[PDB]
Amino acid sequence: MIQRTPKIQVYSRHPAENGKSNFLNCYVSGFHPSDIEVDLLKNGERIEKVEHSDLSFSKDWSFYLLYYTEFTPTEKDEYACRVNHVTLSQPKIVKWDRDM
Amino acid sequence: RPIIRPATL
Amino acid sequence: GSHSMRYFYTSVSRPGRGEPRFISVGYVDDTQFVRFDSDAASPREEPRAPWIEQEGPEYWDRNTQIYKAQAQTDRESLRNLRGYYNQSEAGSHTLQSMYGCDVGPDGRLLRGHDQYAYDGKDYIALNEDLRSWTAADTAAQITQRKWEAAREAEQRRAYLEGECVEWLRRYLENGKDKLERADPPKTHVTHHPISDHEATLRCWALGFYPAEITLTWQRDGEDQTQDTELVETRPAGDRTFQKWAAVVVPSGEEQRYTCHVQHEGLPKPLTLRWEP
């Protein structure tokens, strides 16, 4: 049974602008099996209002999901995505990199 | 719209 | 131009815990339009695009019954595969299925698809002739023999050559504005000093539909495969996509580097430079 580890991208729906509403996206792809848990974080605390896409998969049968939440980025707030998968011995945390 | 596939693997 | 319809089924067994989870999504090109989840409080096929909401109640009710029956069929398939592989009933397993049709600009079927994976590996696939099968291993050969004895490919072909193409054409007509559109990328190049001797150029494509795109860095007209960092094309969440490609270049040579963008919605391929 092949297991594939999730690839993780953390990014905003639009170019981030301080004090302008926006959406924070966490896109996880290329994993298998489909069981997975994803959380979005603000300053280390878990964000509770989080939407996610319906489970689909790619031509190589690996799965992908988009999790996201609305947010208003500011100069001194940090945000991350936290991912649990059977292929990870511990939650994987990827911080949002604001600068393009 | 979806196919109806009662065939089993 | 050319378009496709795809259904993607995922079933995962939960032995000891009864029935498998069954999930379906359907796409036209890169636009999801329906979904079904057997684990929902009240499982129904649900619309995911505005141009599909026009379908009458008979559309949703019957598609819903179709998914529920399919989940029961996939349960037996799962049980069977466990035997083929003499796998204990303890662990959970995944049956995936992907089928649909590609249409060219004139409307004719260009290609039919109907394939299956087990635990994330190719299992059995209908051939491009829609009259034969490719099995991946000796277990898949059991299925192949059953299905070729029962003329299964003829039923698949019938759907792929009629209903699939016909409903695709209808969805394209109901959602012409949205689906026939090609939204070109919004593009720019950013530049980040790394050190006194290196710099990162990042070429951005934002807000494009459909997802297919090519982003290429060139130096004096040569692709930079070894030195290019690419990210997987990603959804923005508003039915558009994003990608970027980055290269590390010697500081003071940034002008030798050009980013080339090919996308269906562009009049002609863009060539982008960094401008200080």
Residue numbers in the entry:
A (entry chain B): 0 to 99
B (entry chain F): 1 to 9
C (entry chain A): 1 to 276
What do the study's own words say?
CD8+ T-cells provide broadly cross-reactive immunity and alleviate disease severity by recognizing conserved epitopes. Here we identify 9 highly conserved IBV CD8+ T-cell epitopes restricted to HLA-B*07:02, HLA-B*08:01 and HLA-B*35:01. HLA-restriction was further validated using peptide pHLA-I tetramer staining for 7 IBV epitopes that elicited the strongest IFN-γ+TNF+ CD8+ T cell responses and displayed >99% conservation among IBVs circulating in the human population between 1940 and 2023. This included 2 HLA-B*07:02 (B7/NP30, B7/NS1196), 3 HLA-B*08:01 (B8/NP30, B8/NP92, B8/NP479) and 2 HLA-B*35:01 (B35/HA231, B35/NS1260) tetramers.
Canonical TCR-docking modes often focus heavily near the mid-point of the α1/2 helices such that central epitope residues play a key role in TCR recognition. HLA-B*07:02 shares 95% sequence identity with HLA-B*08:01, but a significant point-of-difference is an Asp114Asn polymorphism. Repulsion of like-charges may limit peptide binding or require significant changes to epitope conformation for this pHLA combination. Although we identified single-positive B7/NP30+CD8+ and/or B8/NP30+CD8+ T cells across all individuals, we did not detect any cross-reactive double-positive B7/NP30+B8/NP30+CD8+ T cells. This suggests a lack of shared TCRs directed towards B7/NP30+CD8+ and B8/NP30+CD8+ T cells. Furthermore, B7/NP30+CD8+ and B8/NP30+CD8+ T cells have vastly distinct pHLA-I specificities as confirmed by their different gene segments and distinct TCRαβ repertoires. In contrast, the TCR repertoires of B7/NP30+CD8+ and B8/NP30+CD8+ T cells do not overlap. Indeed, even subtle structural variations in pHLA conformation can have an impact on the TCR repertoire. We identified a single TRAV1-2-TRAJ36-associated CDR3α-“CAVREGTG” motif (CDR3α chi-squared (chi-sq) 182.2) and a weaker TRBV5-4-associated CDR3β-“SDRExGG”-motif (chi-sq 90.2) for B7/NP30+CD8+ TCRs.
